[PDB]
């Protein structure tokens, strides 16, 4: 009975499309036509962090806005102090192909994972002064792609087996499973309230998930290729995505549509990472052509460029007080940028 | 300076174990192994000797090699392959006996022309020669109806047939080899090459072959730096 169900799916999709098109009375770029442009954004490098021997592949800031963690493919996880450039910690991993790391919002734990299908959790308090493995989560059936702490006892992971999972660290068992994507899941973003989270997959689609219920509420389409990055707008009512089709897009939750597109004719490379600024006015993106671009998010106009890396730019981040930007790339260096 | 001169001193003890660890890792060469189900990859692994990856180690003339194998992954390779862009070499095992040679060739082409894999070399093991030698002598001409141009092919001059070996198996072997060399010598750059070998089922000399191919790879890279090649 495939024909009837396919026809019903087509009819439901048509109804959804009509109900969406009935709402788009105006466009964002028309309502923001009497707004002064931001101008020209010049930013300069203040620090350069050295010590890794292979490509750096992920980073993450702490909530005190001074310490950060980074992961490399030589099997090392380094914890850095950014005001001084002193190395606070260096942890040797059991496996070389790490692809993600996270730093607890309390400052006591770290986590990592990769091509070994495991999530490893390390305790930093270390009464005896030695960092040792505290936990290993061993349930996914494909490589680990991302992970983010909710608190000291719960964690959310996405895997390259088209699934997401919510884990309880204390007993080491899964608590919730989120299924419904049909391709590898690449990124996830926690909301400011952490009652919801968004996810993007290698099927040109994003979804919104409820943590407590375990169900999918909304699906967002509009890109043309695999989605590599995703993040929330500062107030949790919108988010932004970047794909292999060399375009960024802004999606809205309450209107359930797309609002703005960021692209140019001279850009023919994919996008690796995205982030917002503290006020939400600028959007920063990293590319495969070794550079980073700063966009005016309210008007879809380029406002600046950062160019300091000799290889592919793999990660990007902004602090909670908004005073610095950190970029890492495949040339084994981390750079901190600030505005004069 | 009680707060300082102790965090500055601790950061210097960490930085010497980082340099000491990287010293042992500069004498080791890492390989990536690819095959399929029909290809005798397991026998090759055993002769050289539910997790994501397996590792094996061997040592030749006081040099160390690490070889990595992919375990519990899904069918789609286009994302986790990018992790292997700085290995010394890729070993490709092909069962030379559904048209499976066509899809093996397609995978070879996708690997060859991919960005972030354009500077890595390939060692090709054409496995299961006795099966071909038995099959082509019993009137099973799958090459003739899966590859029409085999009707218009003759043995090359640089062929070195083994003694007591029929011409027909020789033509089959060199046709299948030239199929890969046509892709290899088409869209290169001068920055990576291909090293083909004929392998039996269970053999005892593949270790020397890996040793020699890696040595030639590094010598050619160096000679390209000095503008002498």
């Amino acid at each position: 009975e495939l024909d009837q169900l396919r026809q019903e799916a087509e009819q439901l999709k048509n109804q959804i499309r009509d109900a969406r098109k009935a709402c788009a009375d105006a466009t964002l770029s028309q309502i923001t036509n009497n707004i002064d442009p931001v101008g020209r954004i010049q930013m300069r490098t203040r620090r350069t962090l050295r010590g890794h021997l292979a490509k750096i592949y992920a980073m993450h800031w702490g909530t005190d806005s001074r310490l950060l963690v980074s992961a490399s493919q030589d099997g090392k996880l380094i914890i850095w102090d950014s005001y001084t450039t002193n190395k606070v910690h260096a942890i040797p991993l059991r496996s070389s192909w790490v692809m993600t790391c996270a730093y607890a919002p309390s400052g006591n734990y770290v986590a990592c994972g990769g091509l070994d299908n495991i999530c490893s959790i390390y305790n930093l308090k270390t009464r005896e002064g030695n960092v040792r493995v505290s936990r290993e989560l061993a349930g996914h059936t494909g490589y680990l792609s991302c992970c983010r702490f909710l608190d000291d006892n719960q964690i959310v992971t996405s895997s390259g087996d088209t699934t997401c999972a919510l884990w309880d660290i204390e007993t080491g068992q899964q608590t919730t499973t989120f299924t419904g994507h049909t391709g590898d899941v690449m990124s996830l973003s926690l909301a400011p309230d952490t009652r919801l989270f968004v996810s993007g997959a290698c099927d040109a689609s994003a979804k919104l998930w409820d943590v407590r219920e375990g169900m999918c509420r909304q699906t967002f389409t509009g890109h043309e290729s695999d989605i590599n990055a995703i993040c929330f707008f500062p107030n949790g009512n919108a988010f932004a995505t970047g794909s292999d089709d060399a375009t960024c897009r802004l999606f809205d939750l309450r209107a359930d549509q797309e609002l703005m597109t960021y692209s140019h004719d001279n850009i023919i490379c994919g996008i690796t990472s995205v982030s917002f600024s503290k006020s939400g006015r600028l959007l920063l993106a990293g590319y495969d052509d070794f550079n980073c671009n700063v966009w005016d998010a309210l008007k879809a106009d380029r406002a600046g460029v950062l160019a300091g890396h000799d290889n592919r730019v793999s990660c990007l981040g902004v602090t909670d007080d908004g005073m610095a930007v950190a970029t890492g790339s495949w040339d084994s260096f981390l750079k901190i940028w600030n505005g004069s | 300076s009680a707060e300082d001169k102790a965090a500055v001193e601790r950061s210097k003890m960490i930085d010497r174990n980082l340099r000491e660890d990287g010293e042992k890792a500069a004498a080791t060469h890492r390989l990536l192994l690819l095959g399929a189900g029909e290809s005798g990859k397991s026998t090759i692994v055993k002769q050289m000797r539910t997790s994501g990856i397996f590792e094996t180690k061997f040592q030749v003339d006081k040099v160390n090699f690490h070889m990595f194998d992919v375990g519990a992954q899904r069918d789609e390779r286009r994302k986790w392959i990018q992790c292997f862009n700085d290995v010394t070499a890729i070993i490709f095992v092909v069962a030379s006996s559904t048209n499976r040679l066509q899809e093996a060739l397609n995978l070879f082409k996708s690997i060859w022309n991919n960005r972030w894999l354009r500077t890595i070399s390939v060692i090709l093991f054409l496995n299961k020669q006795d099966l071909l030698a038995e099959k082509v002598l019993a009137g099973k001409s799958k090459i003739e109806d899966y590859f029409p141009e085999f009707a218009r092919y003759t043995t090359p001059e640089d062929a070195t047939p083994e003694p007591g070996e029929d011409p027909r198996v020789t033509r089959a072997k060199y046709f299948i080899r030239d199929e890969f060399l046509r892709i290899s010598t088409a869209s290169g750059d001068g920055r990576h090459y291909c090293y083909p070998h004929f392998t039996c089922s269970v053999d005892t000399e593949n270790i020397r072959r890996v040793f020699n191919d890696c040595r030639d790879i590094i010598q050619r890279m160096h000679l390209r730096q000095y503008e002498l090649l």
């Epitope: 099927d203 043309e224 290729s225 023919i268 | 899904r74 069918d75 789609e76 286009r78 899809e103």
Partner: nanobody
Framework: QVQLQESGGGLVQPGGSLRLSCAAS????????MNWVRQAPGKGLEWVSD????????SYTGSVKGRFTISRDNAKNTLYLQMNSLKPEDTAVYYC?????????????????????RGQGTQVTVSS
């Protein structure tokens, strides 16, 4: 919303001919590379042919070479396969597939594991 819909197919006799069409929507058609794959009863997926962005490079598999002809129309966003002198071994479902990324010279698009950018397919039966 990437969409691809196939048309054609049906039941024919040995020595016959057919013309399969593939209409695409949801992307910039001329930036990508296209190809034709097929699946026979009791087997896996097999790659049949491919054509590039402009149409100056065309590739066929060994068994169908000389009998099939692929073409593309960039103004109307259409892909065509013209099949001549059919045989009973050509009874299968046929799919129209797209490569993952634009401006790119390689593709990984034959997997059974629900490749996302191909269509539902059309059936071709050859019998007396």
């Amino acid at each position: 919303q990437v969409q691809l819909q196939e048309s054609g197919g049906g039941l024919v006799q040995p020595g016959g001919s057919l013309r399969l069409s593939c209409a695409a929507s949801g992307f910039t058609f001329s930036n990508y590379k296209m190809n034709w794959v097929r699946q026979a009863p009791g087997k896996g997926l097999e790659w049949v042919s491919d054509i590039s962005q402009s149409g100056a490079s065309i590739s066929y598999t060994g068994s169908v070479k000389g009998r099939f002809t692929i073409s593309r129309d960039n103004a109307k966003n259409t892909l065509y396969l013209q099949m001549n002198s059919l045989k009973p071994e050509d009874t299968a479902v046929y799919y129209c597939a797209r490569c993952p990324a634009p401006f790119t010279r390689d593709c990984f698009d034959v997997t059974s594991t629900t490749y996302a950018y191909r269509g539902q397919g059309t059936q071709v039966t050859v019998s007396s």
